[PDB]
Design a protein around this ligand. Structure first.
Ligand SMILES: OC[C@@H]1[C@@H](O)[C@H](O)[C@@H](O)c2nnnn21
Ligand SMILES: OC[C@@H]1[C@@H](O)[C@H](O)[C@@H](O)c2nnnn21
Ligand SMILES: OC[C@@H]1[C@@H](O)[C@H](O)[C@@H](O)c2nnnn21
Ligand SMILES: OC[C@@H]1[C@@H](O)[C@H](O)[C@@H](O)c2nnnn21
Lengths: 490, 490
């Protein structure tokens, strides 16, 4: 519903600016036990706990992109995308997760063929090493990223990254070590809505025998140690002058709930716990002060050698931006006690401001509210506080609800003008942000394809391309994809 | 040192703006054991521990203002001062510190006569109820402001305030319950340089059997409870349309040491622990979040009733401003624990910036560096963050060093061009601050009179009027005083 002169055009942006789409391995690949692939944490969680997926489903098939990857590339090419963000399945490459367990050559051939095909079609691969799919072998051996020794997972992740660099590094110039460390740790070990489904006693998850105040910080610490080890390896033995490594953060914009200075403080604590938790370690080598003061002993300390490896451990940064929240102060008092790790921010995160209105229009699912102004706020924080590094918006989109009780007619799914409007408004925000001096360099639509949306199952469709599961995952371009084609190829 | 067009003029300010000078009872009065007056904490400290005073002195005589108050008023009148800020000696009024012990009629009569003399000369009294002189009887009974009951000291202070309102309130329209709660608690119970001289075991004070991490907060909590109760009493039974009550805070300006956001965070924590510690309770009903997060259990909680009495418990506020520091970050770490309560800010306070130069030129004594910009910064914080309430600069001045090893010749002491330049520059800053929207309404030069400068004894002269103690405490106007007379009466 933007007027014609407000619709973004490709020539608003630099010639070397990048437009792409994004997927992740567990969400699209299927072929969960084919050609030597080992079980993952998510295979295990979905198979043993279908009650913890909203529609009882799994990603045994997904979008069948293991078998249908060629048509994925054709879609990207037809839309004139500059790049494709996808992830590598750790267990597909290393079925037992370790060096000892062996490299799976069919796993390697799959990603090799995908990468070469993208490149022969003029499409740049942006490769996520880890997008939440831990080999179940490692989960059973030492709990994966829960590894209390801060050694085994770091070595096993580092070797995995090495295998990717050896086998794909000659063709891949853009790596991201981790995707959404914050969501992964908080949801897997805090609320337990993600595999393996752990949380404190008294809380509603599959395994209420963890600790929602400690385990998320343990896993987060292991993620940062792993990231720093992998980047140290990459810089020393793999990086060339035109290649880049980083990681991608999930981030909601934060706006103070009211005019009180207390809500400004709340807002700052909220940026810190969401983004700062992982950003500040890679920028300066330690967690934010606020988190140290509030989580205290539950947040591990780094060795000085590890801080050195952490500080400056990126050439670029990914931001996965979807929505924003109002941050409202909570005082420290004997009547409040944190239950979840995210409660350490002493701030409630509200959809509705003091007027009772949502921060922006609802996009249809339980959590996405359209607030492009938050993207601008975030890019200005990256510019003015964190050194203005090269930024890619590695995910941005909405999920159309499609359930057994309230089906989404294919016709309505394809006429996705709500998604299109949302994409247009966020892209236009990026131009406004560039004009203000943001070092943002690209934008990736989250979801080339309708796919398995984690604990939501297939109840939400995020694709710019529809996937008919009743057929054989046949792909049809939605209106959003048709505009992106027009946009890129004018 | 200011050029002619830069020297402030009286018509730079509104016609109802207030220029004055300031003293305190223990510092000027003398007559320490006369006319029924009870012993105070400072009598006890100086007499029993002369080794803790730099020149071994006491204020048995002070500037002899108990006997010489008439010439104090004559001096104020000659200078055209609109107002005089002085304090009431708790033990001069209530020798045992309680209702039980009785009111001392000669004490009442003294302050009655001073107040009446000031008013018939057209000088408005600004009366500080407590400027650090606790009746020693209360110190011996329950530790004074250390009272772990949070009850006895509150009742005794509130009764003291009631006696002041009952006996002087018909003539006094401007009351300050407390002077420098931060300095008083930190120096009395943290570093122990002030009476009664308490600090943690291992530290250099007269009685290293306290707790520098706890006692200052206990004392601070009792001060705030006493303030709230006295103001509640005042509002209910004594306040009129044209009268006002508040308190006065010591505050150094804070500037980030470097360009790093970490030093901006350190700067904020420093404002919080210096100013916010006592300001935020009277503004909103609780301590700053940063202090609760860092001091934790060492900082007591308020009852809901107490929070309600505290919030908005002022019609005006005093700021005692002399200097500023650079605030430099200190990370939370296993290799650092606070020793003094002020270490809870996790910031070092530096005189010299990263270029090795001082924040501003030294004024002569150990701690005062001239930085009038810091006053403007402080006034903008009061304006923008804390509601822009009516503000009086209730102290501003410098101390001229005068010692047995390096005497200050009387002529050099009277030609106090360094003091005059400092006073002129800060009054100029107030003009600039008012145009920027500050609700500042007056300025009081600290020290009508050369007086007893606490642990420094008589080694520092802060007067605009010189006091010759080798004669009969005879007063001579310095050049600062002469310029102020010209400024006020031109
Ligand atoms: O999968 C659920 C999604 C995550 O993908 C996002 O990272 C997260 O910010 C969010 N908030 N609520 N639900 N979610
Ligand atoms: O929830 C929608 C998408 C998920 O599908 C992605 O896997 C995840 O990386 C992400 N983070 N923020 N929101 N998302
Ligand atoms: O004596 C030292 C002086 C005290 O006497 C002042 O009253 C106090 O506010 C201050 N802070 N820094 N140094 N001091
Ligand atoms: O140290 C100089 C003066 C003391 O003489 C005053 O008693 C005190 O109220 C104050 N606070 N700030 N600086 N000072």
């Amino acid at each position: 519903m933007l007027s014609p002169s407000e619709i973004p055009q490709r020539d608003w942006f630099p010639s070397d600016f990048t437009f792409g789409a994004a997927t992740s391995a567990y969400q699209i690949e299927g072929a969960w036990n084919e050609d030597g692939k080992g079980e993952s944490n998510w295979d295990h969680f979905c198979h043993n706990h279908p009650e913890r997926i909203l529609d009882g489903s799994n990603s045994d098939i997904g979008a069948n992109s293991y078998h249908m990857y060629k048509t994925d590339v054709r879609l990207l090419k037809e839309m004139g995308m500059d790049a494709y963000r996808f992830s590598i399945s750790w267990p597909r490459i290393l079925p037992k997760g370790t060096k000892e367990g062996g490299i799976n050559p069919d796993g390697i051939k799959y990603y090799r063929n995908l990468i070469n095909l993208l490149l022969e079609n003029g499409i740049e691969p942006y490769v996520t090493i880890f997008h939440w799919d831990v080999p179940q072998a490692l989960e059973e051996k030492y709990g994966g990223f829960l590894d209390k020794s801060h050694k085994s997972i770091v070595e096993d992740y580092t070797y995995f990254a090495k295998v990717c660099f050896d086998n794909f590094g000659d063709k891949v110039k853009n790596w991201l070590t981790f995707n959404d460390p914050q969501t992964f740790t908080s949801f897997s070990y805090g609320t337990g809505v993600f595999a393996p489904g752990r949380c404190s006693p008294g809380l509603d998850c599959a395994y209420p025998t963890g600790n929602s105040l400690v385990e998320p910080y343990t896993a987060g610490h292991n993620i940062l140690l792993a990231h720093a080890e992998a980047v140290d390896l990459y810089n020393k033995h793999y990086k060339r002058d035109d290649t880049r490594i980083g990681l991608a953060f999930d981030v909601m914009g934060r706006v103070p709930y009211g005019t009180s200075f207390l809500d400004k403080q709340a807002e700052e604590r909220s940026w810190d716990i969401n983004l700062g938790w992982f950003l500040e370690p890679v920028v300066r080598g330690d967690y934010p002060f606020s988190m140290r003061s509030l989580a205290r002993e539950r947040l591990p300390f780094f060795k000085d050698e590890q801080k050195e490896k952490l500080a400056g451990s990126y050439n670029m940064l990914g931001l996965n931006y979807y929505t924003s929240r109002f941050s409202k102060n909570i005082d420290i008092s004997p009547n409040y006690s944190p239950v979840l790790n995210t409660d350490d921010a002493y701030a409630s995160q509200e959809v509705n401001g003091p007027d009772g209105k949502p921060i922006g229009p609802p996009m249809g699912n339980p959590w996405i509210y359209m607030y492009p102004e938050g993207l601008k706020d975030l890019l200005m924080i990256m510019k003015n506080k964190y050194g203005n590094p090269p930024i890619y918006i590695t995910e941005n989109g909405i999920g159309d609800v499609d359930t057994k009780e309230t089906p989404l007619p294919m016709e309505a799914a394809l006429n996705d003008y709500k998604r299109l409007d949302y994409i247009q408004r966020h892209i236009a925000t990026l131009k406004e942000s560039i004009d203000l001096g943001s070092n943002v360099q690209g934008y990736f639509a989250w979801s080339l394809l309708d796919n398995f949306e984690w604990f939501a199952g297939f109840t939400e469709r995020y694709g710019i391309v529809y996937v008919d599961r009743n057929n054989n995952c046949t792909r049809y371009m939605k209106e959003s994809a048709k505009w992106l084609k027009e946009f890129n190829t004018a």
